[PDB]
Design a protein around this ligand. Structure first.
Ligand SMILES: Cc1cc2nc3c(=O)[nH]c(=O)nc-3n(C[C@H](O)[C@H](O)[C@H](O)COP(=O)(O)O)c2cc1C
Ligand code: SF4
Ligand code: SF4
Ligand code: SF4
Ligand code: SF4
Ligand code: FES
Ligand code: FES
Lengths: 230, 212, 430, 66, 41, 54, 59
């Protein structure tokens, strides 16, 4: 009656039909590290981080978008799973600029946490390191677009929650500028909610910009006002 | 090469831009080919009509195409920034693509690049202080089986040498245009020895087949 | 079994290489089109798939997926969603002219074959995608579509019988990536050409949500000939996994570079010199030979004098056979320079979906620059080897993999020129 | 008033006690005497998403961008 | 036959592809619809 | 130092041009490296005596 | 390499070298650093209040 058997490193668990490897792996507690997938939006696959060596397959496959055949066994802690994570995490930090002081996501990066906890240490890629000059999206949202890892999270958020359709991919190869082509200051509702979407320090708050870095500030539960929903 | 618009009028919507009702009939043929429910699939042929009509597309062309196909313009800006055949810079009458990658570069396109350069004067990748000589070198096109190649406005030139460069470019100055096909004889992609292909007039349906 | 095989005349699957008797459906009928096709169609598509898997068609375009498995996946029961057939006609692998010859000299057999495929799997309309480089040949294709419509035999109610089948043509806009398996599908969809994810197959969701598929042009051309001819007559030329006839083309560096049909295997010395003039400077002049095109590792001289030309053979040589560019290159150019220019091509055309191809081709472009100028250390050439081990298969498409392999072949074979180049740069700076 | 700092007369201001079950939390708080407010745990709600559903035909869940 | 039977391609103007698509727009069976007229309607 | 740069911070040259060594510098001095759970004891010979630490 | 005065530096004919990147107050083992940062009218991120206690500073 609508079950799927998987072994997560031996520990069996049961999966609803049609779902992902990732929701069951998050069902047993193992958060596979992710960048493009986020549960309020659709599924891109363009961050490629969620590779996991799923057995009897020479090709290591993504886990945010794999249909779950009956009777898997999902090797998370293998050798070449770690080697694929080493490779991908080394690839992200090539054309990313040395901004972790003047980045506004020092306590709250994602490259920083996941590249400590999963990546290499000795870098390579000795020369190069191109840079994309920023835009002027809206005076409430400060915007640096060299740090954009082109992860297509703001784009899907626009076209699938905002419905505004003002952010687009432009270009090919390395050169993918992400934004609005026509010097238009993008202003719409919920554009304040895009600085919480952008996982890396490329879309920050403009008025908050440079007053604190978030280990100092303590976090407290409260209830909203000004809307009747809270 | 500057993938953000930054108006610079002779752009700056509205630049006044409109087609011909004959081209509107082309438009309705194009978005009546594709199935209903997915009107947004004919964006690239409509934009091709806009380029073939007016040699390069301004931004008001993109607003026009967006309102014709009743889409947000952002998809049109993506498809305009994404491909190769659409040049957002204004160009001249004739456009030059000097194609050179793998057999084309090793069969000495650098001689042809020198010939084009020291005949024309304007440097590679750039434009010209007249019309009809927007020169860019390009990557592979497909027609590789000869000398490195030239594409001008929907035509080819293969089997080159700088005297043919002088001739063809003087004639595009004059207005007269030679053939898309090959040179040095050998009227197609031919085995250029002693015709090692088939020779007999082929039989076809006449001889031994089975179940039909 | 043949002794390595060669061209035996009239066993050519399609004649009319160039400029033959006319360019017309009448000439197509004289060369063998529209002959007894209705009796093949009205037997049921299962017998057509039996004919094709009897022939054992290895898929073309340099992938390896056989047509019988693909179109046997295409035997889904037809639900409310229509079925579509897409004829891909770009020419990547620079050096190609694979189907440029075919769509320039004979569109009619392609029309026959797309009718065959539209009957053979339940398809309803076929979109044919031509490269944007090919306006004139595209208009030749348009004239042929007009001739086949003006015959009143395709379009609606084909072969007389009540079976409509419409065919359209969509231009390219210039890409390597529009030729691939899925970025084709969404380039037709009006969104920008970017591949999807594979485990949702095109035969389950395709063009907007239809069970469709994509055929290479050579498959479309070979389809009605094997439908109108016998079973396993196609299979008699070469080995058992791969079978049939293939265009091996020297588009490259010989005297009279050209294109020839041959059988599935051939001795490479006959192939190079006894059909297309001779090698520029003789057999011993060349440094190396690339088969396949550009998504294929190199083959050096001591391997090229002996290795036969089969798909299994180039598996046994750790490469992958593609089409149309089985060419030599001379000692007189540096293979480092040639492959570095190919890497620059790879940078200039790649979409930006996957992180690893994007940044790997970025590094490899800059590192091959630092090798042509020679400004590195031997740990860098092994670094390039390690990163080409990292990239491969970790993407969506195979452009990243076909950028992994040339660096691989250059490292597997042509170490010594690299070492001498770096040594001469040491002599230069010192 | 000399440096611009935030003093406090609250020695208990920087307590935190990380526990593992709500039962032992309440047991400790009532064992040590002071009052307590219980807010309940909230998991993320499981969803139903798929890439093929992002490629719809006559369903409106359509990717529209890529 | 050793003569170039083409040059039938040679006359092709830069509008002819859309001209042929224009004139061959009869027998267009209905390109089957689905629910709404468009993805966003 | 160790070359296991996820424990000891790197030096200035790679710090001023890396990316990984800069990130490791940054987070290694903000958070402190994570230490696996468990209880250890050791003792060395202080010139007093058993300098033990638990 | 003596450790004394707690002095600051600046760029060659340039502005203040401190970005106010809060690392010193994040590491300061008696928390004697007190940084409150603001941008100015230019745009480069800078400070407001950079205080060292000499009492708590263990050097
Ligand atoms: C890297 C890559 C490049 C491709 N380039 C082309 C191309 O230029 N033209 C083309 O028709 N197909 C191209 N394809 C598709 C292949 O030809 C593929 O085999 C085709 O979709 C089906 O061919 P088959 O079924 O005969 O194997 C490409 C595929 C890949 C992975
Ligand atoms: S701006 Fe941020 S969310 Fe958008 S693609 Fe770039 S990194 Fe991702
Ligand atoms: S997002 Fe910010 S903190 Fe993270 S790596 Fe980039 S610059 Fe550093
Ligand atoms: S490997 Fe590169 S070109 Fe291919 S799908 Fe991925 S991002 Fe696109
Ligand atoms: S905040 Fe501290 S660590 Fe950062 S620049 Fe200023 S003095 Fe240096
Ligand atoms: S999470 Fe980004 S690829 Fe699956
Ligand atoms: S490389 Fe010049 S056309 Fe293919």
């Amino acid at each position: 009656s609508n079950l799927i058997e998987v072994f997560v490193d031996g520990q069996s668990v049961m999966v609803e039909p049609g779902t992902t490897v990732l929701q069951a792996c998050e069902k047993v507690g193992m958060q596979i590290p992710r960048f493009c997938y986020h549960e309020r939006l659709s599924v891109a696959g363009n961050c490629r981080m969620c590779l996991v060596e799923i057995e009897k397959a020479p090709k290591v496959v993504a886990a945010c978008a794999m249909p779950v055949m009956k009777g898997w066994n999902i090797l998370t802690n293998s050798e070449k799973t770690k080697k694929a994570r080493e490779g991908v995490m080394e690839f992200l930090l090539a054309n990313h600029p040395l901004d972790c002081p003047i980045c506004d996501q020092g306590g709250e990066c994602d490259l920083q946490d996941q590249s400590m906890m999963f990546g290499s240490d000795r870098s390579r890629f000795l020369e190069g390191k191109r840079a994309v000059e920023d835009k002027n999206i809206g005076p409430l949202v400060k915007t640096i677009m060299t740090r954009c890892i082109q992860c297509t999270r703001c784009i899907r958020f626009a076209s699938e929650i905002a419905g505004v359709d003002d952010l687009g991919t432009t270009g090919r190869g390395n050169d993918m500028q992400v934004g609005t082509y026509i010097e238009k200051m993008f202003m719409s509702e919920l554009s304040g909610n895009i600085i919480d979407i952008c996982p890396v320090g490329a879309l920050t708050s403009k008025p908050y910009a440079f007053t604190a870095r978030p280990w100092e500030t303590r976090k407290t539960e409260s209830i909203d006002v000004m809307d009747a929903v809270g | 090469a500057l993938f953000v618009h930054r108006d610079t009028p002779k752009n700056n919507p509205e630049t006044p831009f409109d087609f011909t009702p004959e081209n509107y009939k082309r438009i309705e043929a194009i978005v009546k080919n594709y199935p209903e429910g997915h009107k947004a699939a004919a964006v690239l042929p409509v934009l091709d009509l806009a380029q073939r009509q007016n040699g390069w597309l301004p931004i008001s062309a993109m607003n026009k195409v967006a309102e014709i196909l009743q889409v947000p313009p952002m998809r049109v800006y993506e498809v305009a920034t994404f491909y190769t055949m659409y040049n957002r810079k204004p160009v001249g009458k004739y456009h030059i693509q000097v194609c050179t990658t793998t057999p084309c570069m090793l069969r000495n396109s650098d001689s042809i690049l020198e010939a084009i350069q020291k005949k024309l004067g304007i440097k590679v990748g750039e434009t010209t202080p007249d019309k009809l000589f927007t020169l860019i070198e390009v990557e592979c096109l497909g027609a590789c089986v000869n000398a490195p190649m030239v594409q001008i406005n929907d035509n080819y030139y293969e089997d080159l040498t700088p005297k043919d460069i002088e001739e063809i470019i003087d004639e595009l100055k004059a207005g007269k245009i030679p053939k898309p096909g090959p040179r040095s004889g050998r009227f197609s992609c031919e085995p250029a020895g002693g015709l090692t292909s088939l020779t007999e007039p082929p039989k076809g349906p006449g001889f031994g087949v089975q179940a039909g | 079994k043949t002794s390595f095989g060669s061209l035996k005349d009239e066993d050519r699957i399609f004649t009319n290489l160039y400029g033959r008797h006319d360019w017309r459906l009448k000439g197509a009928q004289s060369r063998g089109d529209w002959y007894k096709t209705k009796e093949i169609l009205l037997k049921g598509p299962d017998w057509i798939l039996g004919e094709v898997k009897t022939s054992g068609l290895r898929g073309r375009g340099g992938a390896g997926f056989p047509t019988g498995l693909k179109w046997s996946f295409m035997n889904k029961p037809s639900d409310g969603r229509p079925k579509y057939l897409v004829v891909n006609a770009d020419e990547g692998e620079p050096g190609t002219c694979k189907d440029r010859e075919i769509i320039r000299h004979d569109p009619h057999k392609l029309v026959e074959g797309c009718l065959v495929g539209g009957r053979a799997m339940g398809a309803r309309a076929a979109y044919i995608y031509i490269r944007g480089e090919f306006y004139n040949e595209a208009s030749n294709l348009q004239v042929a579509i007009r001739e086949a419509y003006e015959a009143g035999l395709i379009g609606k109610n084909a072969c007389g019988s009540g079976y409509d089948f419409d065919v359209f043509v969509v231009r390219g806009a210039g890409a390597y990536i529009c030729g691939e398996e899925t970025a084709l599908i969404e380039s037709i969809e009006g969104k920008q050409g970017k591949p999807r994810l594979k485990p949702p197959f095109p035969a389950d969701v395709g063009v907007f949500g239809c069970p469709t598929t994509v055929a290479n042009v050579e498959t479309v051309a070979v389809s009605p000939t094997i439908c109108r001819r016998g079973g396993a007559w196609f299979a008699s030329f070469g080995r058992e996994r791969n079978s049939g006839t293939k265009l091996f083309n020297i588009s490259g560096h010989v005297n009279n570079p050209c294109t020839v049909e041959e059988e599935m295997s051939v001795p490479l010395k006959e192939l190079i010199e006894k059909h297309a003039g001779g090698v520029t400077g003789g057999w011993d002049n060349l440094l190396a030979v690339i088969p396949g095109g550009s998504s294929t590792p190199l083959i050096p001289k001591s391997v090229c004098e002996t290795v036969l030309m089969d798909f299994d053979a180039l598996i046994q040589a750790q490469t992958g056979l593609g089409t149309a560019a089985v060419i030599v290159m001379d000692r007189s150019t540096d293979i480092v320079k040639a492959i570095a220019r190919l890497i620059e091509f790879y940078k200039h055309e790649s979409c930006g979906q996957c992180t690893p191809c994007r940044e790997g081709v970025d590094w490899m472009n800059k590192v091959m620059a630092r090798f042509v100028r020679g400004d590195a250390r031997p740990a860098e050439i092994d670094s390039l080897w390690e990163i080409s081990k990292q990239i491969e298969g970790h993407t969506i498409c195979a452009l990243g993999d076909g950028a992994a392999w040339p660096v691989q072949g250059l490292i597997r074979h042509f170490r010594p020129e690299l070492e001498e180049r770096m040594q001469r740069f040491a002599q230069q700076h010192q | 008033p000399l440096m611009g700092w935030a003093s406090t007369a609250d020695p208990l201001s920087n307590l935190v006690l990380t526990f593992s079950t709500k039962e032992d939390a309440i047991a400790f708080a009532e064992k040590n005497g002071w009052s307590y407010d219980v807010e309940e745990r909230k998991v993320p709600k499981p969803k139903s998403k798929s890439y093929g559903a992002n490629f719809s035909w006559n369903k409106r869940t359509r990717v529209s961008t890529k | 036959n050793t003569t170039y039977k083409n040059l039938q391609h040679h006359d092709y103007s830069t509008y002819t592809f859309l001209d042929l698509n224009l004139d061959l727009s009869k027998f267009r069976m209905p390109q089957p619809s689905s629910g709404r007229e468009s993805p966003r309607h | 130092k160790v070359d296991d740069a996820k424990v000891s911070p790197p030096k200035r040259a790679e710090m001023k041009t890396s990316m990984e060594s800069l990130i490791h510098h940054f987070k290694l001095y903000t958070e402190g490296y994570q230490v696996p759970p468990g209880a250890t004891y050791t003792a060395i010979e202080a010139p007093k005596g058993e300098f033990g630490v638990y | 390499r003596f450790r004394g005065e707690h002095a600051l530096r600046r760029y060659p004919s340039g502005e203040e070298r401190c970005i106010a990147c809060k690392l010193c107050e994040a590491v300061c083992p008696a928390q004697a650093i007190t940084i409150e940062a603001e941008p100015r009218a230019d745009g480069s991120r800078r400070t407001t209040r950079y205080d060292i206690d000499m009492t708590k500073c263990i050097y």
